[PDB]
């Protein structure tokens, strides 16, 4: 479990690359399993910035 | 001329071994037949397929 913006979604992926999976969150090539994710801008985004 | 049995299975043995290493420069529907070219040019699991 992480939060990230809605354009990195898309690198959490096994064979993927960018700069989350490349360098904070890496799956493996014969990963078996589900990637969930949900907009959660009322949550954890905040007035000035969280 | 009289010794053409003897001198065909020479030459059956040599066309059928040149065919074998000519087949190596075959491509059977991938990017190149060089195996270090493929490795170079893509990704992982896209290298893979080829």
Known sequence: SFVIRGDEV?????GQTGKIA????????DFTGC???????????????? | SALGKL?????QNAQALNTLVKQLS???GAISSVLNDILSRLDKV???VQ
């Open chain 1, 35 to 50: 990637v969930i994710a949900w907009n959660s801008n009322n949550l954890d985004s905040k007035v000035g910035g969280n």
């Open chain 2, 26 to 28: 075959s491509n059977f």
């Open chain 2, 46 to 48: 896209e290298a893979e």
């Open chain 2, 7 to 11: 001198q065909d299975v020479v030459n």
């Open chain 1, 10 to 14: 898309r690198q959490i992926a096994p």
């Open chain 1, 22 to 29: 490349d360098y904070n969150y890496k799956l493996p090539d």
